[PDB]
Amino acid sequence: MEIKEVDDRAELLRYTNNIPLLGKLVNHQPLWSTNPKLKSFSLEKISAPDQRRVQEALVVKDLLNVLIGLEGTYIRYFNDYEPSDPETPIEFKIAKKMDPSFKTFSRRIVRYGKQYMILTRAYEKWSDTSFGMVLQRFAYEIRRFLEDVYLKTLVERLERDFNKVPNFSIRELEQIINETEVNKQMELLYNIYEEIFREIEERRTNESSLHLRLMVAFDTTVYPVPKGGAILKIFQQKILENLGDRSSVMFLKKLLNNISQDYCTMLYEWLTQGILNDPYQEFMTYDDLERAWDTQYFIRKDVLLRDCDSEEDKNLLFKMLRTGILLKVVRASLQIPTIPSNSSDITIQEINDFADLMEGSNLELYVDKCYSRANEIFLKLFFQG
Amino acid sequence: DVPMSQPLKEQEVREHQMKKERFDRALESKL
Amino acid sequence: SSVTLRQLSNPYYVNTIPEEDILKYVSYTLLATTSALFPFDHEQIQIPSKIPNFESGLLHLIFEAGLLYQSLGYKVEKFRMLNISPMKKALIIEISEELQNYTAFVNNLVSSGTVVSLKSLYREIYENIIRLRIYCRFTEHLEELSGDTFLIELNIFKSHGDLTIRKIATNLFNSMISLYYEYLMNWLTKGLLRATYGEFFIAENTDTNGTDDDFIYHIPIEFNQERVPAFIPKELAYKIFMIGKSYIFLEKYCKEVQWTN
């Protein structure tokens, strides 16, 4: 094929003021549609039987590039695709002159390429500090998936076979994508992306407790981002949607198990030490005062683990708050950063598995233990000290 | 059905709690 | 029969640069050096026309590391030539450490002979690209910022959900804070305020005005509560101040040097 003279240049973007911390800091290749670079090939010239195999080879080469977000020779980015503006929709043009069997396979395969680009873009966006902590960890997990699985498969299994296997065909390509369940994992992640995304678009679009209260307010602010419990709930819902699919739920559970580690760590310290450190505002609660004893408390309704429209959850919520508050008071009175395991003889194990804690009335017992420790320590000091 | 009152202790207990709450709420509403 | 799909596609790429030539000059570009194949300028990488857009796009991604590497190297030199807070140097040192690690990594992959494709290359270097991206953003306007400011931002990043962010933010912090520790020691054991560049909350009071220029009633030490960092409880920040102030009082005016020493 003939080559058009196009002067491309790789360079750093000069302005990063609106670029996510982990986003791309460089420019991009010009699009085919503006700077073709190669002379067009008509396809029809090689459409005959026994020429067709070559057309297939060319199509597969394109799919390999499509799967990592690059256009190919006969598969081109959508005309209104705008690589310099990462809001742009992702779509592809398939040369109409391509054998229809390929056009069919291509649509089935390109779809994963679309998910790839979207997910890649999504985790980059999510690196911003405006996003919740759990979501940031999720973004991390996505990124790792892509390197660990998605591309691992593409690079070591598929490109390698294109290069070395005499009978590799587009038929096998589809088979591999599915038999390794990489596509399944992509779909699950993708579906999560869409759910989060949709929820965000909605976020963008839109007294029964008095006997036990202190100076506490219910924070009903609906955040643009489903931080804290709001993300965790999505995962729970996705598990419910996937019930009966053991592979899927195991996958999803691994993600939940990973993203929830920091949340439950934050919770642990609040409940066993009274120490809450929530720079990303994920937590179910926060207080005033960032003399200073007139602490007001707030309940972040929007990031709670339980909606608390039931008596049991309301009771649990308040016990949890009290637990942490009692502990905070003790630390303040003793002027200690921490309350030791050598205090009241109650051992509170760390939360190892968030979902396990949410499952069954485990919060209730876990919290009762926590509460009890806070209470016994508090009482010891107040009565005897 | 028999046109009868529900039990009396319960009626009084409810009155006591409502009265206590009426008082408490007179204050809770500002405090 | 035995012909593979690549072998079949080859006749249409005859006028383009083969993978081997690309690989042979890519590593040089990754280390931000230039080459005939990739005429890398002080800023831009010229991309010759014999590289198709598919490959160009992949190379824009691969080469990001060279571009980031180049940028970081330039600022390291920028700072090397300046008299700056040792805590900034701590960051500079960490940048250099990362660049050294990058280098070793790249050379390992390249010299191993195991990179036979750009896709493989991209996947392997991918993590390092990210690490560089992180440093590149963290070091923006490094020269406009004070050492405390960075410690504060690092503390925020240390809680970030991303694990690489935590590792880097943590390590950068640790490097810098260890010098904050040293500043505190200089103050605590010597009563010394040195090379603070305003980054330390205790400062020499140079605001003299004739009366007491000989420091008879006043010892010229400021306690800038507003500059006290998050990791030092106010009570201690003040206590720290008074320890060094007392050290000075004592050593300078009472002259109980043997004890003091």
Numbering used by the authors:
A (entry chain D): 1 to 206, 223 to 306, 318 to 412
B (entry chain U): 112 to 142
C (entry chain C): 163 to 423
Authors' own words:
Microtubule (MT) nucleation is regulated by the γ-tubulin ring complex (γTuRC), conserved from yeast to humans. In budding yeast, homologues of the grip-containing proteins (GCPs) GCP2 and GCP3 (Spc97p and Spc98p) and two copies of γ–tubulin (Tub4p) form a 300 kDa complex (γTuSC). Spc110p, a distant pericentrin homologue, recruits this complex to the nuclear face of the spindle pole body (SPB), while Spc72p recruits it to the cytoplasmic face. In yeast, the CM1 motif is required for seven identical γTuSCs to helically assemble into a γTuRC at the SPB.
Finally, by local 3D classification we observed that a closed state is populated in our γTuRCWT data. This state had previously not been observed in the γTuRCWT structure as robust symmetry expansion and 3D classification techniques had not yet been developed for cryo-EM when the structure was published. While not identical to the disulfide crosslinked closed state, the differences are minimal, indicating that the conformational changes observed at highest resolution in γTuRCSS are representative of those occurring in the closed WT γTuRCs. The fact that the WT closed state can occur spontaneously and is sampled in our open population suggests that, in the presence of Spc110p, the energy differences between the open and closed states are not large. The observation that a population of γTuRCs in the WT filaments adopts a locally closed conformation indicates a small energetic barrier to a single γTuSC closing, although simultaneous closing of an entire ring is unlikely.
